[PDB]
Amino acid sequence: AKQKMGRVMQTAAFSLAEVSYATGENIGYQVQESVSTARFKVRARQENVSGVYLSQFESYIDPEINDFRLTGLGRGGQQVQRAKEIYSRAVETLVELASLQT
Amino acid sequence: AEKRTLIAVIADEDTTTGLLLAGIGQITPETQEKNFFVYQEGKTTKEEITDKFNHFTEERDDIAILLINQHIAENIRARVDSFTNAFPAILEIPSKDHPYDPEKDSVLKRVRKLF
Amino acid sequence: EGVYFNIDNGFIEGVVRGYRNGLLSNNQYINLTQCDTLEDLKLQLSSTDYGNFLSSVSSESLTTSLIQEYASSKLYHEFNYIRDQSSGSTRKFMDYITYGYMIDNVALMITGTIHDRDKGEILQRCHPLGWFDTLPTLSVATDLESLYETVLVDTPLAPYFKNCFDTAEELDDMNIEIIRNKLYKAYLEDFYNFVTEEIPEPAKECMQTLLGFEADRRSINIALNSLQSSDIDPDLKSDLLPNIGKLYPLATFHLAQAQDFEGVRAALANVYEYRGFLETGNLEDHFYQLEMELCRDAFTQQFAISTVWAWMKSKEQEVRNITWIAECIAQNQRERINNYISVY
Structure with a gap:
């Protein structure tokens, strides 16, 4: 899965990159300040495989808010809504790789 | 520990913006510290990377998983290899503007022996 | 009647019309799409009036962001040069x-x-x-x-x-x-x-x-x-x-x-x-497609600033298509080759 993820993450990065200039303006400057709520946090899951402790990671997905008041300006609100869920899936997929490394 | 909740990101803006868009991060006004140290190409040195790595790992108990670009880790590759603990779950994330190689991983180095 | 137009704004029309004639049709775009490496794309572009200023300038460090930066720079230079030969009302x-x-x-x-x-x-x-x-x-x-x-x-x-x-x-x-x-x-x-x-x-x-x-x-x-x-x-x-x-x-x-x-x-x-809320692929792509039909219609008169206003956006759309191709080439995800609009 290492290389599979190394490539799908680049695919998602490309998917958003082609989106970032559809509105023809910077989005990062507003993004890095707007984000003030967290949803894709993690929880310590326990599973004694063979009588041995293993604190695994559960993808604590909270799909109710990710960043407030960053869409509807009139040129790019819809476009960012497109590739965002790609990252929402990619991060959940990436949680499991670390869960396995631990 | 149950404090292993927050996620650390040391990556270029093209990835950090999207990561925060997915809702992984936030602003921590209690220290005015972001969940990440933004990276600027050709403007950020290597000592900053080491300092933020140490701050996220051995100074912050919040971080559970760390995402770092391959090129950024290259600046602290020796530091990353030297440090090997299960708590931070260090992960060399693929980097935008660079086709990531899934073989530069410090973690995968131990996988490369005793198949 | 438009007779009074060419008392202070003749060369404005001349230069804008020449630059419009410099537009690259889909025939050049299809050839540019076939290119795979950044050097191939840049050398294909160099055979056009759009190029000769982007290639042979860098050290083969062509990236999509740098492609967008350099491509838009010449449009800015054209606009600023027309500013350098402006007029009273035109400046206002x-x-x-x-x-x-x-x-x-x-x-x-x-x-x-x-x-x-x-x-x-x-x-x-x-x-x-x-x-x-x-x-x-x-x-x-x-x-x-x-x-x-x-x-x-x-x-x-x-x-x-x-x-x-x-x-x-x-x-x-x-x-x-x-x-x-x-x-x-x-x-x-x-x-x-x-x-x-x-x-x-x-x-x-x-x-x-x-x-x-x-x-x-x-x-x-x-x-x-x-x-x-x-x-x-x-x-x-x-x-x-x-x-x-x-x-x-x-x-x-x-x-x-x-x-x-x-x-x-x-x-x-x-x-x-x-x-x-239909016929929606990339919403702004469809907006560009619909708007460019009118923008082309604006290029039919020769006695109004409509030419300048439409050409400002025509060159920006040229850059948009260039970026749409560069994104899939440099990132090596060939899925945007067909996602470009050219009606000139």
């Missing part, structure tokens, strides 16, 4: 074109109050069109209230203020979005008023119609996306909407007073000119 008109740009530039400067992003680096990525040399933002108190009057005096955007004094002390996401909304509304309204009273006859209709189309697509985007990641009262929905859409003065209220997805579908589907 170009400020209107640049207003929509330093609107966002000063919005970014205001946002950079607690982060302190330098003016130079902002210019390295923002729109230089809006830049005016008398913009000392990160040299005095960058507080939006303190800097309010400094900006008010720096550039004459004061008349574009629709009660901008109160609710201008937040430094928050809502404030930064509403300021841009109000600024666009006031700017487009005042521009429409200006052209409707002071402009030669041939532009009178083209400018107003194209402004109406752009204002409509701008008004819809603040209603469709008002139910995607945030919510607001209908009063502000009406406030941020332009007073006159120039294509529909009745359906704007229908959009404003509605708060659900299908309370706005009829407002857009009634006009029977654009499908209601």
Whole structure:
């Protein structure tokens, strides 16, 4: 899965990159300040495989808010809504790789 | 520990913006510290990377998983290899503007022996 | 009759028409798409009037971001050269074109109050069109209230203020979005008023119609996306909407007073000119496709500034297609080769 993820993450990065200039303006400057709520946090899951402790990671997905008041300006609100869920899936997929490394 | 909740990101803006868009991060006004140290190409040195790595790992108990670009880790590759603990779950994330190689991983180095 | 036009604005028409003749049709685009490596794309481009200034300049470090930066630089140089051979009325008109740009530039400067992003680096990525040399933002108190009057005096955007004094002390996401909304509304309204009273006859209709189309697509985007990641009262929905859409003065209220997805579908589907929330691939791609049919029609007259206004966006669309191809080439995900529009 290492290389599979190394490539799908680049695919998602490309998917958003082609989106970032559809509105023809910077989005990062507003993004890095707007984000003030967290949803894709993690929880310590326990599973004694063979009588041995293993604190695994559960993808604590909270799909109710990710960043407030960053869409509807009139040129790019819809476009960012497109590739965002790609990252929402990619991060959940990436949680499991670390869960396995631990 | 149950404090292993927050996620650390040391990556270029093209990835950090999207990561925060997915809702992984936030602003921590209690220290005015972001969940990440933004990276600027050709403007950020290597000592900053080491300092933020140490701050996220051995100074912050919040971080559970760390995402770092391959090129950024290259600046602290020796530091990353030297440090090997299960708590931070260090992960060399693929980097935008660079086709990531899934073989530069410090973690995968131990996988490369005793198949 | 247009006879008086060529008393001060002949070479303006000449240069704009020549640059329009410099447009690259789909025949060159298909050849450029076949290229795989960045060097192949750049050398294919070098065989066109669009190139010879992007390739043979770098050290084979061609990236999509750098491609966009260099490609847009020559368009900026062309615009600034025409500025260098401008005229009285033409100069008094170009400020209107640049207003929509330093609107966002000063919005970014205001946002950079607690982060302190330098003016130079902002210019390295923002729109230089809006830049005016008398913009000392990160040299005095960058507080939006303190800097309010400094900006008010720096550039004459004061008349574009629709009660901008109160609710201008937040430094928050809502404030930064509403300021841009109000600024666009006031700017487009005042521009429409200006052209409707002071402009030669041939532009009178083209400018107003194209402004109406752009204002409509701008008004819809603040209603469709008002139910995607945030919510607001209908009063502000009406406030941020332009007073006159120039294509529909009745359906704007229908959009404003509605708060659900299908309370706005009829407002857009009634006009029977654009499908209601359909024929949507990349929404802005379809917007460009629809707008460029009119922009081409604007290139048929030879006695109005419509030529300049359409060519400004024609070159930007050239850059848009270049970026659409460079994204899939450099990132090596061949899925945008067919995602480009060329009607010239």
